[PDB]
Symmetry: C3
Amino acid sequence: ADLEDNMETLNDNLKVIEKADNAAQVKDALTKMRAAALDAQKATPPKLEDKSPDSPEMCDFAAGFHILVGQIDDALHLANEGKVKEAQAAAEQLKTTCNACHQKYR
Amino acid sequence: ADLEDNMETLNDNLKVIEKADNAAQVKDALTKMRAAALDAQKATPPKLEDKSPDSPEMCDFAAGFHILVGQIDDALHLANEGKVKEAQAAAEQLKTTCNACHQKYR
Amino acid sequence: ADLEDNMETLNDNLKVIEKADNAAQVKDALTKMRAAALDAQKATPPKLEDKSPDSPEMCDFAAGFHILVGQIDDALHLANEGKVKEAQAAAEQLKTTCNACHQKYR
Ligand code: HEM
Ligand code: HEM
Ligand code: HEM
Ligand SMILES: CC(=O)Nc1cc2cccnc2c2ncccc12
Ligand SMILES: CC(=O)Nc1cc2cccnc2c2ncccc12
Ligand SMILES: CC(=O)Nc1cc2cccnc2c2ncccc12
Ligand code: NI
Ligand code: NI
Ligand code: NI
Ligand code: NI
Ligand code: NI
Ligand code: NI
């Protein structure tokens, strides 16, 4: 999907995590987010359209999704053990990564 | 499989490697060990049950199977080249990675 | 496929790229090259037959294909955006990595 569609998936699903009751719900939402971050990593953002793929910008752009995925995995690990509240508090910490890339490239 | 079962798999097949006649026997046994190592890496050990996935402890545990798997691959390469005695020796060097992790987490 | 077959493939498609009209041909060629590099990374070159899979030499051999594959990925990206001329320029810089390996290990 488009960079746009993937970001939607990230955004809506972060909302789903915040108001989840059980860990299955957090797990499912974290799994959809993981898929969409891997896919958003393949897109060229409008701001970078002039840059070759080995430039520091493009590489730092793909690095942003490497971190986010790493963080989603942490939250996934917690959801899998039924630890709902620490998995939610793990997902909160994704935002810093979201905002930071947006400061740079959005 | 869980941790205990996986460690049994590691142990028994290391013993097969010691007794092995040909490269095929070694190769087969290393493959099983590879898979058991990758499976055990997914588990939380009892000593670390209370630990965050982000822990220095959980990461150093996960890393121990990363070292182990890389060593298996070294031994796997030699088994593939028909080199039994050098595959056998490569597997004897696994032992130290066994011992270091058990010292911390067993 | 042995080393020779994979290198033949590497050589052939590099030419295809050089005389190509459009991005599709370049992309098709680069996709065949990538498969060949990954497959050649599995081979023990005749010069390093005695060498341990642990060797600085063997490790350095594997690393060469890692660089080649990354450079092919750079070139794939460009052909995908439909930037023929600049994908071709990216493919021209591959020869650096071909030659450096040949001087050592061929
Ligand atoms: C879970 C964390 C994230 C959330 C909730 C999120 C959410 C969003 C939302 C709602 C948009 C606007 C969608 C639109 O109006 O089309 C957006 C756009 C964007 N995001 Fe994120 N995002 C996250 C992570 C990231 C990261 C880590 C990066 C950097 C690699 C990134 C890069 C971008 C870019 C470049 C745009 C602009 C899209 C465009 O205008 O074409 N996002 N994001
Ligand atoms: C090939 C090398 C290895 C061998 C031969 C080996 C063998 C064993 C054996 C025989 C046990 C007996 C306990 C049981 O029956 O469950 C065991 C347990 C255990 N092993 Fe290993 N192991 C190896 C590598 C590792 C590594 C690298 C780690 C850590 C990264 C590790 C972590 C553990 C832990 C945490 C236990 C105790 C689990 C529990 O309390 O249920 N092992 N292993
Ligand atoms: C696109 C880049 C490359 C091209 C076009 C290329 C091309 C070739 C060609 C045409 C041969 C001779 C085949 C024959 O025997 O007739 C060859 C041999 C060889 N190349 Fe490459 N090569 C490339 C990259 C590499 C890399 C990255 C490495 C190692 C990291 C490497 C290592 C070798 C070795 C070891 C041989 C000797 C094969 C043998 O004697 O059996 N090459 N190469
Ligand atoms: C250093 C890095 O990750 N660069 C790249 C960054 C990229 C960012 C978005 C889309 N593609 C790429 C890309 N594609 C092929 C090769 C490299 C890249
Ligand atoms: C740094 C690291 O490897 N941490 C982890 C360590 C882990 C150790 C056992 C089981 N799972 C994990 C884990 N799971 C998801 C995300 C991270 C980890
Ligand atoms: C660092 C590295 O990639 N060394 C190796 C380099 C290799 C080069 C050709 C074929 N196999 C290997 C290999 N196989 C198993 C384990 C390690 C290697
Ligand atoms: Ni897509
Ligand atoms: Ni985990
Ligand atoms: Ni299991
Ligand atoms: Ni190998
Ligand atoms: Ni082959
Ligand atoms: Ni790309």
